[PDB]
Write an enzyme that holds these catalytic residues in place. Structure first.
Site, PDB file in Angstrom:
ATOM      1  N   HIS B  24       0.823  -1.222   0.000  1.00  0.00           N
ATOM      2  CA  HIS B  24       0.000   0.000   0.000  1.00  0.00           C
ATOM      3  C   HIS B  24       0.855   1.270   0.000  1.00  0.00           C
ATOM      4  O   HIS B  24       1.236   1.772   1.071  1.00  0.00           O
ATOM      5  CB  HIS B  24      -0.918   0.054   1.228  1.00  0.00           C
ATOM      6  CG  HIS B  24      -1.884  -1.090   1.373  1.00  0.00           C
ATOM      7  ND1 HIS B  24      -1.526  -2.307   1.921  1.00  0.00           N
ATOM      8  CD2 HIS B  24      -3.219  -1.166   1.131  1.00  0.00           C
ATOM      9  CE1 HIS B  24      -2.588  -3.097   1.969  1.00  0.00           C
ATOM     10  NE2 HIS B  24      -3.630  -2.429   1.498  1.00  0.00           N
ATOM     11  N   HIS B 259      -4.008   3.410  -3.794  1.00  0.00           N
ATOM     12  CA  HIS B 259      -4.375   3.012  -2.439  1.00  0.00           C
ATOM     13  C   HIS B 259      -3.705   1.706  -2.034  1.00  0.00           C
ATOM     14  O   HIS B 259      -3.167   1.599  -0.925  1.00  0.00           O
ATOM     15  CB  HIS B 259      -5.885   2.853  -2.286  1.00  0.00           C
ATOM     16  CG  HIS B 259      -6.254   2.027  -1.091  1.00  0.00           C
ATOM     17  ND1 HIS B 259      -6.151   2.503   0.200  1.00  0.00           N
ATOM     18  CD2 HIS B 259      -6.644   0.731  -0.982  1.00  0.00           C
ATOM     19  CE1 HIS B 259      -6.507   1.554   1.049  1.00  0.00           C
ATOM     20  NE2 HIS B 259      -6.805   0.466   0.359  1.00  0.00           N
ATOM     21  N   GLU B 408     -20.181  -1.430  24.543  1.00  0.00           N
ATOM     22  CA  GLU B 408     -19.502  -2.718  24.711  1.00  0.00           C
ATOM     23  C   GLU B 408     -18.214  -2.816  23.885  1.00  0.00           C
ATOM     24  O   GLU B 408     -17.167  -3.231  24.406  1.00  0.00           O
ATOM     25  CB  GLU B 408     -20.449  -3.860  24.350  1.00  0.00           C
ATOM     26  CG  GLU B 408     -21.628  -3.983  25.284  1.00  0.00           C
ATOM     27  CD  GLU B 408     -22.821  -3.201  24.776  1.00  0.00           C
ATOM     28  OE1 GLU B 408     -22.687  -2.544  23.709  1.00  0.00           O
ATOM     29  OE2 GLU B 408     -23.872  -3.222  25.460  1.00  0.00           O
ATOM     30  N   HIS B 470     -32.884 -11.465  24.386  1.00  0.00           N
ATOM     31  CA  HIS B 470     -31.995 -11.379  25.546  1.00  0.00           C
ATOM     32  C   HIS B 470     -31.495 -12.756  26.024  1.00  0.00           C
ATOM     33  O   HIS B 470     -30.884 -12.845  27.091  1.00  0.00           O
ATOM     34  CB  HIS B 470     -32.712 -10.649  26.697  1.00  0.00           C
ATOM     35  CG  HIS B 470     -32.838  -9.160  26.518  1.00  0.00           C
ATOM     36  ND1 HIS B 470     -33.520  -8.582  25.465  1.00  0.00           N
ATOM     37  CD2 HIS B 470     -32.390  -8.129  27.280  1.00  0.00           C
ATOM     38  CE1 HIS B 470     -33.473  -7.264  25.577  1.00  0.00           C
ATOM     39  NE2 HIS B 470     -32.800  -6.962  26.673  1.00  0.00           N
TER      40      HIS B 470
HETATM   41  C1  LIG Z   1     -26.926  -3.527  23.498  1.00  0.00           C
HETATM   42  C2  LIG Z   1     -27.540  -3.516  24.862  1.00  0.00           C
HETATM   43  N1  LIG Z   1     -26.705  -3.421  25.919  1.00  0.00           N
HETATM   44  C3  LIG Z   1     -27.288  -3.407  27.126  1.00  0.00           C
HETATM   45  C4  LIG Z   1     -28.650  -3.475  27.336  1.00  0.00           C
HETATM   46  C5  LIG Z   1     -29.232  -3.460  28.736  1.00  0.00           C
HETATM   47  N2  LIG Z   1     -30.076  -2.271  29.006  1.00  0.00           N
HETATM   48  C6  LIG Z   1     -31.365  -2.209  28.711  1.00  0.00           C
HETATM   49  S1  LIG Z   1     -32.049  -0.721  29.073  1.00  0.00           S
HETATM   50  C7  LIG Z   1     -30.532  -0.120  29.652  1.00  0.00           C
HETATM   51  C8  LIG Z   1     -30.407   1.268  30.218  1.00  0.00           C
HETATM   52  C9  LIG Z   1     -30.411   2.351  29.165  1.00  0.00           C
HETATM   53  O1  LIG Z   1     -30.999   3.551  29.734  1.00  0.00           O
HETATM   54  P1  LIG Z   1     -31.909   4.553  28.928  1.00  0.00           P
HETATM   55  O2  LIG Z   1     -31.933   4.239  27.483  1.00  0.00           O
HETATM   56  O3  LIG Z   1     -31.524   5.999  29.236  1.00  0.00           O
HETATM   57  O4  LIG Z   1     -33.347   4.296  29.546  1.00  0.00           O
HETATM   58  P2  LIG Z   1     -34.332   4.917  30.626  1.00  0.00           P
HETATM   59  O5  LIG Z   1     -34.103   4.290  31.960  1.00  0.00           O
HETATM   60  O6  LIG Z   1     -34.032   6.454  30.608  1.00  0.00           O
HETATM   61  O7  LIG Z   1     -35.722   4.645  30.047  1.00  0.00           O
HETATM   62  C10 LIG Z   1     -29.557  -1.091  29.540  1.00  0.00           C
HETATM   63  C11 LIG Z   1     -28.119  -0.991  29.927  1.00  0.00           C
HETATM   64  C12 LIG Z   1     -29.447  -3.574  26.148  1.00  0.00           C
HETATM   65  N3  LIG Z   1     -30.782  -3.662  26.190  1.00  0.00           N
HETATM   66  N4  LIG Z   1     -28.873  -3.595  24.929  1.00  0.00           N
HETATM   67  C1  LIG Z   2     -12.858  -3.198   9.774  1.00  0.00           C
HETATM   68  C2  LIG Z   2     -12.231  -3.135   8.417  1.00  0.00           C
HETATM   69  N1  LIG Z   2     -13.059  -3.029   7.355  1.00  0.00           N
HETATM   70  C3  LIG Z   2     -12.467  -2.980   6.152  1.00  0.00           C
HETATM   71  C4  LIG Z   2     -11.102  -3.029   5.951  1.00  0.00           C
HETATM   72  C5  LIG Z   2     -10.509  -2.970   4.561  1.00  0.00           C
HETATM   73  N2  LIG Z   2      -9.838  -1.681   4.256  1.00  0.00           N
HETATM   74  C6  LIG Z   2      -8.561  -1.440   4.501  1.00  0.00           C
HETATM   75  S1  LIG Z   2      -8.097   0.117   4.073  1.00  0.00           S
HETATM   76  C7  LIG Z   2      -9.696   0.489   3.529  1.00  0.00           C
HETATM   77  C8  LIG Z   2     -10.034   1.832   2.936  1.00  0.00           C
HETATM   78  C9  LIG Z   2     -10.027   2.957   3.944  1.00  0.00           C
HETATM   79  O1  LIG Z   2      -9.352   4.105   3.364  1.00  0.00           O
HETATM   80  P1  LIG Z   2      -8.577   5.191   4.211  1.00  0.00           P
HETATM   81  O2  LIG Z   2      -8.607   4.768   5.627  1.00  0.00           O
HETATM   82  O3  LIG Z   2      -9.113   6.593   3.904  1.00  0.00           O
HETATM   83  O4  LIG Z   2      -7.097   5.135   3.681  1.00  0.00           O
HETATM   84  P2  LIG Z   2      -6.226   5.663   2.467  1.00  0.00           P
HETATM   85  O5  LIG Z   2      -6.685   5.051   1.186  1.00  0.00           O
HETATM   86  O6  LIG Z   2      -6.395   7.203   2.505  1.00  0.00           O
HETATM   87  O7  LIG Z   2      -4.789   5.356   2.880  1.00  0.00           O
HETATM   88  C10 LIG Z   2     -10.521  -0.602   3.697  1.00  0.00           C
HETATM   89  C11 LIG Z   2     -11.973  -0.705   3.373  1.00  0.00           C
HETATM   90  C12 LIG Z   2     -10.312  -3.140   7.141  1.00  0.00           C
HETATM   91  N3  LIG Z   2      -8.974  -3.197   7.100  1.00  0.00           N
HETATM   92  N4  LIG Z   2     -10.893  -3.188   8.358  1.00  0.00           N
END
Ligand SMILES: Cc1ncc(C[n+]2csc(CCOP(=O)(O)OP(=O)(O)O)c2C)c(N)n1
Ligand SMILES: Cc1ncc(C[n+]2csc(CCOP(=O)(O)OP(=O)(O)O)c2C)c(N)n1
Ligand SMILES: [Mg+2]
Ligand SMILES: [Mg+2]
Lengths: 658, 658
Positions: B24, B259, B408, B470
């Site tokens: 590259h 690229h 996460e 879940h």
């Molecule tokens: C991807 C993911 N990670 C974690 C959870 C667990 N979870 C469910 S509701 C929640 C709290 C999010 O709070 P918010 O959206 O502000 O809700 P509120 O209490 O204000 O209604 C979490 C951590 C989930 N449902 N999905």
């Molecule tokens: C998660 C992920 N998705 C896709 C790729 C494949 N990939 C490597 S470089 C690239 C293009 C991104 O271009 P940029 O970061 O702007 O670099 P440049 O061409 O300017 O050097 C892609 C899709 C990867 N390495 N990782």
């Protein structure tokens, strides 16, 4: 009845959660005003026709507030949500499960619960409406014309997938998408001062969206005016609404203690007193029912009658479009793809299966005008382009190639949204090793029953110089274990034709295609028609064989060559090709005994990947030649030799089994 | 000269890529000026002590540009990157593989390639420096005091994981993190006008970062002035630098044709002429080597020698801290945890293993002061809190609980960064079903050899009312197939103490812990010391048994109860508990025969998840009681009965085996 109607929503939620002893009351008490304003002034929906193709769509991204949506559907008159079903919330066999599910409850548009994916998948709903409108509408006949709405919370805007989606949607100018953000300063472990301090509206301005603020979350006229302004803005919209979680609870409002546990008897009695609600559990006065029947059901039913008269006149004015649009309203494809569309291939033809895939998907695109897709900045290596079109965007709405950028997760959610809308068939591509970035959206394809096609190229250590971070090992095992996913790894150009034909005619199962970088040779024993069985015989030198080799993809060429060597030493052997383990497992028990007979226990499996799933076919007295370490950076012929994939080594593996 | 030295970097990369016929060049030619400025003016590194603990850290997030980093390490004088190794780019066994690899090549701080993870993981490098500085520094003795620097591209800032990390880092105010963004308006499929049109610097202001713009990417003085400003700002920084990809190529610069493919012979000759470079491939003049010896090598050695004197004076002034800092500089833990730190447990005690997990990790935190962790807004359900502390932030830098928010994927990369730095032991929690959101970072934990501990609770259909989105099914099989990952699923509280002890003493293997919502009972036959073998016997009524049950986790209680019932009717049976399939597979062949004798082929496996991986142990003549559909929304006792997990159904499955 506005204050009266609003509190009816709140207390149906509180009481239903107390009787199941399980659920989430905080969000229902905070968001009831803005949801009531949306159902009574914006949405066109018809409870007598819940699957109407031109209805406004709605997605509850904060899926834990499911009792808010169940109360609104019951009060509006949807048949599946009776009072008896409200009293069975979260019980076995009910229409009111703990999180919303598509296809189980009539009136619900999308399955939610996993945070971030609701607001992301709504992008695809809106894009699908834009394509169908550009293809089929004519002057005086707006057959496809509706909005897409969502309610979200703090958790949805912390997840990365929704940042990807909003960046793409701003570039695409999807002006019919409208999002309400419940902004209550609380999440599960405490206050947002310790978790989420960014300026959300300044970030959404940088993407090219419209933004606004509503300071008093109980003011119904302020909420309506902001939605009207958003629909006239010419941009996708995010409206921040300030509310109090648990509004009305004197001891627990504004705290995380009302996020995900029932209020209980003592606090529930203090909440009735503070809000002036003297009705008993599941007692709703007739005033409230009549309010919802005028402003939701009758309004929605009138709009539905005018649409049907419009469609009838449209078929008379444009008879050349009538057949296709009639099919789509029936829930069928506009044109039928068949096996006779793919040309025959010659024995010995040499082609890599990423290139075979481009040939077959161009046959499908020329036959079926509602088939479309794209790639995550890898079209020039996945080979996904439909070669008669350019790129799709606001100024070119009928082109069928989409550039997603480097956004694998959001790409999954957008395909799901286009498949949920109705009318289309879609696909999307990336490298096999980065399927980890999109795995959680693949699960929602399998859960909702959507026939979405994922295109994963560059499938093994045969990648070569890029090295271990770019070389798959464990990924087939992970995908094969997921319920309702069909994984295909074809052996040559002929098997690749068949897998695409199955992917595009599937009814309710998504498909994953695993394709090669390096060339493969079309075998004399492969067969288009037999791929639909999952496994079949491609070589056999004696009907009384006592040895079986099993192989997939690029290892089928290798295993056939080894069998001819073993045969010239006097062995009696059979070679089985298995392009899908998931499809073979579903066949009749008689067919499985014909392919893998119980009396022949000398068995060997070959695949450039983890050994794990092959012991259900070779057993304790067989062997498996796979890969159970990470890869290496070097030219591919050298790496294959060091990892044991030569004809010589396979011959050795078979002779030492006894 | 500066211009002479800058072109040396470019043509070393160009020529090495042509010789391998793979790599590259575009990013090497565009980013050489900013990279030269950083190394000669900012970084303190010592080529004779590559692993110095107070060196400035550097991460190449745009991993495809590896030749840019190898050229820099060669001219600076690092022993592993000789000129012969440059001539071995991307070849088998070389020290210069296609993407950078931590551990393989001395002077590389982190493994990169998968986009987004480099800039994200740098957040944890900086957090580690902050914690050790607060704990051990004293007035006059700044033992830990260094910056963290990164170079990134367009692809890095489209990936969702980098938005999560930047939001988190703005709240945390990590003011010693410095990011250079190479803004060249090009990606893999073409121009950014079709993929990426947001206002990047306006979005980073909304997070609370400092931002700046450098319009002329070859002006070394403008570049230097911008970094000095950034280091004094008191915020994490992002500097946007405008460059031309492939700078110098008269026919290809500024297009995606540079690229990811070699320039080739014709265009290389035209590029040598355009930039005035008159040296043959792999020919570097002496003046360039002396420019690097003075301004990176000699400058870093001087800083190192001063640091060694400061540490010696510090240990004389504070003898109460000398032993812990000595251990850390040696690469060991400052305190040793042993088995006698965990208290003995009574047979029959009832406790859910998420709660056993909280007890064991608080034992660990009281003994080892460099043990810390957190959860992704699920602390109150995962049970992850260290009970003597509050939350860690810019005002309270010594607390040991971290709130990552609903993020996460980014959580995984910050843990990896904290473990890469050196000196600490770390962990982090979420629900088991959302391991899909963090899987790509777990893979980097295993590839780099990092003993990071993941805490996954609420592990099966026993979740009950929240429903299928879940409830994990396929997740154990996906993780057990990853190379270099130990998966433990403990049977009771006794087995949980032991898993935590092994997780925290692992030297180069990450650990995943899988834990229950509901209570389990301590068995008579479980044993702390035998967990290190992966599987062992927990029940046996006669030495001439003819049947073997195999079970894990909450299914060990069920299997021992079914076994006792069979015994009462005259059978002879053994029960095997297997808390880790991955560790059992590494034992001596004699120990495998002791636990699962070849001559006993009646075998039944029991586990509430996918069946795929259990056929390796039961073969073709046994059975497996598992789950191969999605879950359901109802109270847990009802769901377990409907899916067959009862004492009565298991007894029946054993009796129908023949
Ligand atoms: C991807 C993911 N990670 C974690 C959870 C667990 N979870 C469910 S509701 C929640 C709290 C999010 O709070 P918010 O959206 O502000 O809700 P509120 O209490 O204000 O209604 C979490 C951590 C989930 N449902 N999905
Ligand atoms: C998660 C992920 N998705 C896709 C790729 C494949 N990939 C490597 S470089 C690239 C293009 C991104 O271009 P940029 O970061 O702007 O670099 P440049 O061409 O300017 O050097 C892609 C899709 C990867 N390495 N990782
Ligand atoms: Mg909230
Ligand atoms: Mg770029």
């Amino acid at each position: 009845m506005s204050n009266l109607s609003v509190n009816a929503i709140r207390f149906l939620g509180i009481d239903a959660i107390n009787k199941a002893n399980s659920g989430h009351p905080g969000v229902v008490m905070g968001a009831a005003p803005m949801a009531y304003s949306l159902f009574t002034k914006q949405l066109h929906i018809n409870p007598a026709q819940p699957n109407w193709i031109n209805r406004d769509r709605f997605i509850l991204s904060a899926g834990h507030g499911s009792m808010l949506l169940y109360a609104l559907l019951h009060l509006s008159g949807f048949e599946d949500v009776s009072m008896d079903e409200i009293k069975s919330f979260r019980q076995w066999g009910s229409k009111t499960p703990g999180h919303p599910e598509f296809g189980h409850t009539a009136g619900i548009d999308a399955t939610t619960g996993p945070l971030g994916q609701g607001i992301s998948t709504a992008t695809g709903f809106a894009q699908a409406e834009r394509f169908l409108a550009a293809k089929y509408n004519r002057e005086g006949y707006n057959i496809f014309d509706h909005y897409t709405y969502v309610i979200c919370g703090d958790g949805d805007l912390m997840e990365g997938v929704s940042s990807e989606a909003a960046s793409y949607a701003g570039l695409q100018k999807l002006d019919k998408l409208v999002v309400l953000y419940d902004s209550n300063d609380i999440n599960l472990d405490g206050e947002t001062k310790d978790s989420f301090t960014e300026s959300v509206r300044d970030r959404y301005n940088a993407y090219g969206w419209h933004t606004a603020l509503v300071e008093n979350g109980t003011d119904l006229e302020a909420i309506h005016a902001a939605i009207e302004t958003a629909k006239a803005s010419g941009k996708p919209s995010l409206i921040e609404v300030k509310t109090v979680i648990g509004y009305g609870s004197p001891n627990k409002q504004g705290t995380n203690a009302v996020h995900g546990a029932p209020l209980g008897a003592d606090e529930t009695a203090s909440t009735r007193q503070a809000l002036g609600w003297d009705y008993e559990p599941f007692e709703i006065p007739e005033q409230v029912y009549a309010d919802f029947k005028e402003h939701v059901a009758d309004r929605g039913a009138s709009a539905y009658q005018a649409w049907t008269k419009l469609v009838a006149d449209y078929k008379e004015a444009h008879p050349e479009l009538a057949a296709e649009v009639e099919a789509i309203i029936d829930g069928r494809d506009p044109v039928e793809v068949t096996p006779a569309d793919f040309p025959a291939l010659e024995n010995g033809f040499s082609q890599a299966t990423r290139n075979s895939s481009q040939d077959a998907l161009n046959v499908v695109a020329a036959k079926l005008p509602t088939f479309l897709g794209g790639s995550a900045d890898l079209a020039h290596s996945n080979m996904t382009y439909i070669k008669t079109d350019g790129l799709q965007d606001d100024a070119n709405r009928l082109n069928r190639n989409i550039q997603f950028g480097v956004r694998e997760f959001a790409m999954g959610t957008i395909l799901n949204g286009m498949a949920l809308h109705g009318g289309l068939r879609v696909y999307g591509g990336t490298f096999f090793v980065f399927s980890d970035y999109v795995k959680a959206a693949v699960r929602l394809s399998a859960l909702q029953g959507l026939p979405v096609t994922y295109v994963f190229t560059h499938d093994s250590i045969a990648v070569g110089e890029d090295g271990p971070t770019h070389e798959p090992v464990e990924h087939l095992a992970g995908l094969r274990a997921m319920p309702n996913l069909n994984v295909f790894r074809p052996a040559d150009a002929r098997e690749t034709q068949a897998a695409w034909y199955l992917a595009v005619t599937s009814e309710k199962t998504p498909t994953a295609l695993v394709l090669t970088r390096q060339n493969l040779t079309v075998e004399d024993g492969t067969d288009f028609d037999k791929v639909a069985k999952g496994a079949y015989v491609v070589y056999e030198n004696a009907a009384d064989f006592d040895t079986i080799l099993i192989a997939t993809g690029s290892e089928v060429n290798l295993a056939v060559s080894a069998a001819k060597e073993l045969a010239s030493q006097g062995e009696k052997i059979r070679v089985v090709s298995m392009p899908s383990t998931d499809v073979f497992d579903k066949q009749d028990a008689a067919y499985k005994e014909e392919i893998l007979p119980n009396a022949v226990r000398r068995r060997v499996a070959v695949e450039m990947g983890a050994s794990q799933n092959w012991y259900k076919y070779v057993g304790l007295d067989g062997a498996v030649l796979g890969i159970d370490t990470f890869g290496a950076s070097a030219p591919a012929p050298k790496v294959l030799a060091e990892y044991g994939f030569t004809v010589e080594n396979l011959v050795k593996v078979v002779r030492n089994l006894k």
